Amino acid sequence: RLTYGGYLRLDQLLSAQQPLSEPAHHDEMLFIIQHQTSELWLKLLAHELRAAIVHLQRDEVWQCRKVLARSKQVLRQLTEQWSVLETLTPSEYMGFRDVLGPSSGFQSLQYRYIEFLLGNKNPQMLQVFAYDPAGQARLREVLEAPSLYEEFLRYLARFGHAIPQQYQARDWTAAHVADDTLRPVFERIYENTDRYWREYSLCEDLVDVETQFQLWRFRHMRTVMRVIGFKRSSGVGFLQQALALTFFPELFDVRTSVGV
Amino acid sequence: RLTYGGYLRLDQLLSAQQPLSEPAHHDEMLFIIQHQTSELWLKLLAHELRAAIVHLQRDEVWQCRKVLARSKQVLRQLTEQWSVLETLTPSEYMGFRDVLGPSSGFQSLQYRYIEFLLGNKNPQMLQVFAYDPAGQARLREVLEAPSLYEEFLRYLARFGHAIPQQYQARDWTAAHVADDTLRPVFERIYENTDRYWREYSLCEDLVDVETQFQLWRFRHMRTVMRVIGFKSSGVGFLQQALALTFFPELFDVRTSVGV
Amino acid sequence: RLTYGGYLRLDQLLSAQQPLSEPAHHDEMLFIIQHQTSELWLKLLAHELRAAIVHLQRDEVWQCRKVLARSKQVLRQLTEQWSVLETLTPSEYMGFRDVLGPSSGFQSLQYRYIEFLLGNKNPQMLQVFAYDPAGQARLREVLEAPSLYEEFLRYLARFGHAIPQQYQARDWTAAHVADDTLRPVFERIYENTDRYWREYSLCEDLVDVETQFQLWRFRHMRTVMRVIGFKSSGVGFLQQALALTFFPELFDVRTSVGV
Amino acid sequence: RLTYGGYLRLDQLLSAQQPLSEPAHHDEMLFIIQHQTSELWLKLLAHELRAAIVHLQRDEVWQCRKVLARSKQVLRQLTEQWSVLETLTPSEYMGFRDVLGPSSGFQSLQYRYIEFLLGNKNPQMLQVFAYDPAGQARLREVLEAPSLYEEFLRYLARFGHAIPQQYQARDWTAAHVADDTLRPVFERIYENTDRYWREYSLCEDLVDVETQFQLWRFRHMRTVMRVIGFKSSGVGFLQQALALTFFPELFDVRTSVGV
């Protein structure tokens, strides 16, 4: 409706916090809200990222950089957000730890969407979303479509850059594989910025998104460490496995031969 | 339930974003989600603040700093958050501005709840939320009850500090009035830190909260200026809100300490 | 040289901290370092800002946003920096306050420089730096040359924008004055972003710079309120500076855009 | 002295920046200023840290937390600051990379002091600082002394906590070794916060210092990846630094508490 609380639908949003602790624990609210605010930022992040792909498809560089600039800010919020949770100590967590289901952020569809959209494709990850065919659908679509990185590659191909013909038609279902034959394409760009400034721009943006995304990944792991700790794989050690993953290897590799 | 989505009620949460732009505008999502995350934090902030009042009533200091510590982290998110909204250019806002009603954050009951709870009480303000009598009642409660700051002077009083006897009971509905007799009480606290380290810790926690709150107030204002411009109420109203103060005595002593 | 400490000349830098408190005060290290770190960023800020103007003179757009982008990060550090100083309680400050002279950051050449570079000129300032003819000379250089904003207006003038002829040559030593005739120029750009995407990006970069600056300005004022106090000049001077603006036209158009 | 630039010694501080690129590369100023500001906070960090150790020795809890609170903010700035250096692309670095020397932060005497101070003791590290007997002597002093953590464990021993007698006296020159007998000491502190609130507070302050320091450690590595890429030593060396832990017992107890 026309009301502030009506437009934002606050009665719906503000009644979604249901602590399931009979006695009612003080620190459960934070646990819930810290999860919901993230889910909200992820939604927006997905909305802006999808626009990054369309803009690239359309050779609209200034538009894409814009949406990417917002994504970074959103991603940064996701990251910065862990600071509040860092206040949840083991003595507090202990109070409502039990009444928690076996669930985990691994079931985060939106998160998965992001991961897929950025290039970390994984077919076997479709079954974990069977309960909801609609969402599984939205996930399969992005899974079959080239990633942000791939659309960025097909973009460079449309403007003289020696992009391996394979990036014209392939099974996008399979996650991108580090392609060494992509190093010279990025050496040219990094050695002639004044000329390839557009591409240059998107490159650093891409590096920004991946980097900021790793910060989130890391801050995420550290928080878990101080809450439930390690125990050394699927768990705290697993979150350490994701840190090794990269969205745009080629981009980082070139850093080792650029200007040699 | 046991679901990740079921425990967080994501279907109910992720279906609250309802863009009213008939043609459907890209940047309108940011408008909504930006408001919603803030509200979710405002709700947590209240949760914590309320406990800050119960611990003070119980003389539970270390427990009180803990919640205020969290409150500060949250208040810091709220402030930092604007950075993402500062990316909403006037060109964009121009595309869904019209569909928006005359309503503004002035209707944020939760916000108003934080305002009163911190001391900035305003009786003739509970009218705007006449629509929701249930929430109105919850608002009138914190209004008629001692503020976070007032329940702090009570704490000082129980431990032998020269706190005016008027604080033991009065019209809580009326905002706090700068008290000159409070100056000597805090000058003492700050000159004998080791002796009054507890009251000295709580004092700075209060100065932090207010400062942070003012940061949010300022950032909010600046974001508005870069979206709808300045040039009465409107963005000018926000300007006045910055002159407000929660714990005047706390800031005043700063100029008398050790003089 | 080629050593770590030798390249960075750490011996010289690391010996620039000289607390003058005879009895020696623990918190005098923070007060000294809080300033020196900021003065180091300011230097970078000036180094990057001077390159922004040059790049703007040569129509080198992407380069300009590149240096400005860094300039925004630096400003963001300078701003977030106040956090560590907010931990300077009146009780601690009170201990080494007396050993400090009447001086103030008002004597910061780098700060004034930046202030001049952005357009906030003020000839009556060169006088406070009469002790340094070499540095003062630097101020005059930026005090007589077109400001960042002005160099941006001339930029627009070379690409067919109704930029008033009075900007091709004038007394740059005089602080810029709001011009209603610039309103239509920025409405066109803001209502046709695709077309004017370059000018559009540069406008938001400037709006970002001024905004981050205000935050730095504001945070500065608040930290002072909590250390010293509210005594126009003094703390009232810090409050007044907030009223200032580097690119008014840029913030005014926000009211008559897309209407 | 009484002058702003006098007291802060701005002529000394602002003349320590000497790029070695003959043609004078625009981006070398950042490279140099990025390090100097760090070394500035590091010097403060150590100052506050050393104050913590003493406080703990005298059983001055609220004083210890205070300095530790400032330490956190310094580390935070030291961590946040990586954003500005992230704006240096491989193209820019390339222009002055060649004239750079083989020196790395591994030569930072101050950083090392911090590392040792927190417990990461390393006898064979004194050698890399032999060129400076005055500084080496400073490191050897904090190397043979109990670290912040060790002094903390000595703190607990003074109040009924079952702390292994070995911490009463031993070779402090050797880095602390994970001890399973400490587990029950922290389980008792976390499962009885109302009783051991002081201990509880110091335990979380310590957990924050190490976490923030790990963040700084991680951003540092990430910024290195985008400047010089990845491809024992170098980048793979920064990856191992994250595997280190200052207070293992504090993190491992997280899995035994409440069970």
Ligand code: HEM
């Ligand atoms: C109380 C704080 C939290 C703790 C202790 C925690 C702990 C964990 C653990 C132990 C895992 C391991 C994966 C598995 O076995 O399923 C995990 C995964 C994950 N968590 Fe968290 N979590 C916390 C908060 C959050 C929040 C607020 C989000 C919001 C999105 C989140 C998102 C995720 C995601 C997406 C994964 C897996 C994705 C991947 O494979 O990279 N977690 N978490």
Ligand code: HEM
């Ligand atoms: C597109 C960005 C935004 C703009 C342009 C904006 C603008 C305004 C304006 C013009 C007012 C003045 C009151 C009136 O005449 O109705 C106002 C008040 C207010 N806004 Fe915002 N707003 C924005 C976002 C937000 C968000 C996300 C929140 C969430 C907390 C918020 C909370 C408030 C509050 C609480 C007040 C009134 C409080 C007081 O009485 O001091 N606003 N806003």
Ligand code: HEM
């Ligand atoms: C202990 C914390 C600080 C306090 C209490 C403080 C206080 C003040 C006060 C009272 C003024 C009024 C102006 C005057 O009469 O000269 C002022 C101005 C100023 N201070 Fe700070 N200051 C602090 C730290 C700093 C630092 C670290 C910088 C670093 C640049 C700084 C820079 C300035 C500048 C540039 C001005 C005046 C410029 C303008 O006119 O806008 N101050 N300060």
Ligand code: HEM
């Ligand atoms: C241009 C950005 C920077 C890059 C690419 C970079 C790169 C590196 C590399 C490759 C190493 C590994 C050791 C070696 O083989 O020499 C290293 C170590 C180190 N760097 Fe940086 N660095 C940068 C900036 C800084 C700054 C500003 C500081 C601040 C003091 C710093 C402090 C250190 C320290 C302390 C170590 C070693 C500590 C340990 O043993 O874990 N670096 N750096």
